[PDB]
Design a protein around this nucleic acid. Structure first.
Ligand SMILES: [Mg+2]
Lengths: 172, 29, 70
RNA sequence: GUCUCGAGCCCUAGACAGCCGGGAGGUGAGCUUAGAAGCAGCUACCCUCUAAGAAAAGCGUAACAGCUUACCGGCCGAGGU
């Protein structure tokens, strides 16, 4: 099979070996697309994903590579943005961005600050009880958002009662 | 070739005489 | 606006309560004209264009109560 | 998990899925009940407008409200089940 992806006018995509780089006004994303017998190439104005095999496993990755590239197109132009809301009941949760990591203090009254490092060129902006995770790499942004929600994970007690934490409000 | 589609094409042609595809259809006869 | 069907029937029928099992327990009766009058009051409540169809709607809340016709 | 072979049905008169829009009136059916208005129970389950739209398939409410299934329309476009 063969699938052709017409790259947007705003974008220009270069590729060497198994690596593809996509640059736009919003940034650049480079990815490795490696799978048995699947060739990815830049044919002037279109990215081509092809293979001589058509078995279930091959088709799976071909479809996967497509969305990966399309997501990169979207990331270098419109970008990716995840919205989050910090909710708390008794203890005022302090969420701050310090360096290249988001820090959360006084979680459930905890003396020790919970923290996580931000992935790649992902930007985290906080406005009161609202957070916005953004960047050109959906992988990096998605994880950073997820890591923030996972950071307030609680296993010890009943979550239905202890609902404090930062949650994903809007997903792109 | 469902009958309801044929019957609809006729009913449409009838009101024109006195789905978008069934309208387009009923305009080419 | 104008009172519901279930009520406008119980008046010109002479009965108050319907039947536990309709079309099986003919509680009341209604002349054709009796239904023609009930079709003259619900002009706004009904969607029909002609008085003919207006009747059909009204004549659909009677046989399901035991309100035979003649 | 994956490969191969067969049968039936649906599909460019646009299928399958997804997304958007519509999901309307008589009427909150009758009964039971202080109340029950799709959705406690019993019975019936009828016709209008129309391209559709149940006397309501599933949640939801003290009962309403609210959220969707059926059903129809559009977007899309090739196989689908
Ligand atoms: Mg315990």
């Amino acid at each position: 099979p063969r699938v052709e992806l017409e790259i947007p006018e705003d974008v220009d995509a270069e590729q060497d070996h198994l690596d593809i780089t996509v640059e736009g006004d919003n940034g650049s994303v480079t990815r490795r697309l490696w799978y048995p017998d699947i060739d990815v190439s830049v044919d002037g104005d279109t990215v081509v994903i092809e293979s001589d095999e058509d078995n279930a496993k091959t088709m799976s990755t071909i479809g996967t590579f497509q969305s990966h590239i399309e997501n990169m197109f979207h990331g270098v132009t419109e970008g990716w943005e995840y919205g989050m809301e910090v909710f708390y009941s008794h203890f005022p949760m302090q969420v701050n961005v310090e360096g290249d990591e988001v820090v959360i203090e006084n979680f459930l009254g905890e003396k020790a600050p919970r923290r996580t490092t931000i992935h790649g060129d992902t930007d985290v902006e906080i406005d009161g009880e609202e957070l916005t995770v953004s960047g050109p790499d959906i992988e990096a942004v998605g994880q950073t958002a997820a890591d923030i929600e996972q950071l307030t994970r609680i296993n010890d007690k009943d979550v239905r009662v202890f609902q404090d934490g930062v949650y994903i409000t809007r997903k792109p | 070739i469902p009958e309801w589609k044929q019957e609809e094409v006729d009913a449409i042609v009838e009101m024109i005489e006195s789905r978008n595809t069934l309208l387009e259809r009923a305009l080419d006869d | 606006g104008v009172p519901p069907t279930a009520e406008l029937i119980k008046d010109e029928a002479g009965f108050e309560t319907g039947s536990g099992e309709p079309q099986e327990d003919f509680v009341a009766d209604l002349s054709v004209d009796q239904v023609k009058q009930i079709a003259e009051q619900k002009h706004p409540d009904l969607l029909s264009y002609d008085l003919t169809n207006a009747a059909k709607e009204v004549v659909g809340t009677c046989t399901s109560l035991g309100v035979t016709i003649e």
